[PDB]
Amino acid sequence: FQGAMREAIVLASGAGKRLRSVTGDVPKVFYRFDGCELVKYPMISLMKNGVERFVLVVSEGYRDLGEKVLNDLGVEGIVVENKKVELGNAYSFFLSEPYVESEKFFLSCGDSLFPPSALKSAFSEDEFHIKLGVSKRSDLIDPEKASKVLVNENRIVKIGKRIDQYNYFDTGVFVMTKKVYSLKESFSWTEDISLYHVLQKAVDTGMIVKVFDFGNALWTEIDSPADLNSKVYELMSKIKEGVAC
Ligand SMILES: O=[As](O)(O)C[C@@H](O)[C@H](O)[C@@H](O)C(O)O
Ligand code: NA
Ligand code: NA
Ligand code: NA
Ligand code: NA
Ligand code: NA
Numbered sequence: 001f002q003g004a005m006r007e008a009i010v011l012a013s014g015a016g017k018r019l020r021s022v023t024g025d026v027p028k029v030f031y032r033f034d035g036c037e038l039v040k041y042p043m044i045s046l047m048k049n050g051v052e053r054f055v056l057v058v059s060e061g062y063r064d065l066g067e068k069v070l071n072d073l074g075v076e077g078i079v080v081e082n083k084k085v086e087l088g089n090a091y092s093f094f095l096s097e098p099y100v101e102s103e104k105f106f107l108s109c110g111d112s113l114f115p116p117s118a119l120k121s122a123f124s125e126d127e128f129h130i131k132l133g134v135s136k137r138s139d140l141i142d143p144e145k146a147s148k149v150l151v152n153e154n155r156i157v158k159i160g161k162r163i164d165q166y167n168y169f170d171t172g173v174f175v176m177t178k179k180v181y182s183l184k185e186s187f188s189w190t191e192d193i194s195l196y197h198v199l200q201k202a203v204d205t206g207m208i209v210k211v212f213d214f215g216n217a218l219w220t221e222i223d224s225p226a227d228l229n230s231k232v233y234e235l236m237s238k239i240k241e242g243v244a245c
């Protein structure tokens with residue numbers, strides 16, 4: 001009982017302010033690094049895990065760019081425009097609700113870089129509302145960029161940026177279920193809400209919040225010019241194997 005998940009939500013609506021010196025006017029998610037748009041790398045790893053439909057969330061004004069990404073990869077999807085980018089990536093996630101056609105689906109940040117085997121342990125049909133991809137592998141990640149997770153067995157105990165006890169990093173990849181959308185009304189929406197804050201709220205409201213381990217898979221989040229290096233280029237090469245991105 002390991003079932004493939006055919007659908008993924010990909011969040012591709014951030015500014016990418018810290019990478020502006022490299023990307024200029026173009027949002028980092030649609031800028032090419034090693035010859036593919038950054039957003040294509042998590043999309044390809046998800047397609048290599050059986051995903052066949054994306055809900056791609058972009059900022060107001062980039063529908064075209066989102067559509068080109070889907071055409072290029074030859075994959076089905078719908079592009080959804082986010083008119084409130086200042087409400088954070090939790091808002092980008094809650095926007096996807098009307099568009100999702102499955103009970104259980106992947107969610108990935110459009111700037112999380114990971115190879116297809118990172119998701120190998122994500123397929124257990126166990127009981128959960130959220131399952132976060134976590135890793136201890138830290139050679140690539142900037143530990144100021146990733147949120148930190150205290151895990152006991154496979155449960156999230158606590159999660160955030162400034163937490164004083166933690167054993168894993170949040171990779172920006174998740175398995176979500178439709179029950180997660182019921183948290184949309186639990187925030188005031190007068191300030192930016194991050195996805196890790198949604199997980200912390202899930203724990204605080206009695207949901208089952210679990211993790212799957214990336215194990216030894218190379219992974220990172222691309223936020224600043226200093227995240228780009230030879231090891232990241234070799235991870236991009238790996239993800240693109242056998243694909244004209
Ligand atoms: O992908 As998460 O770390 O769960 C939440 C993301 O929204 C947050 O904005 C980032 O700072 C992140 O990297 O922590
Ligand atoms: Na990010
Ligand atoms: Na542990
Ligand atoms: Na549900
Ligand atoms: Na937050
Ligand atoms: Na944040």
Ligand code: NA
Nearest residue numbers: 135214215217
């Ligand atoms: Na890993």
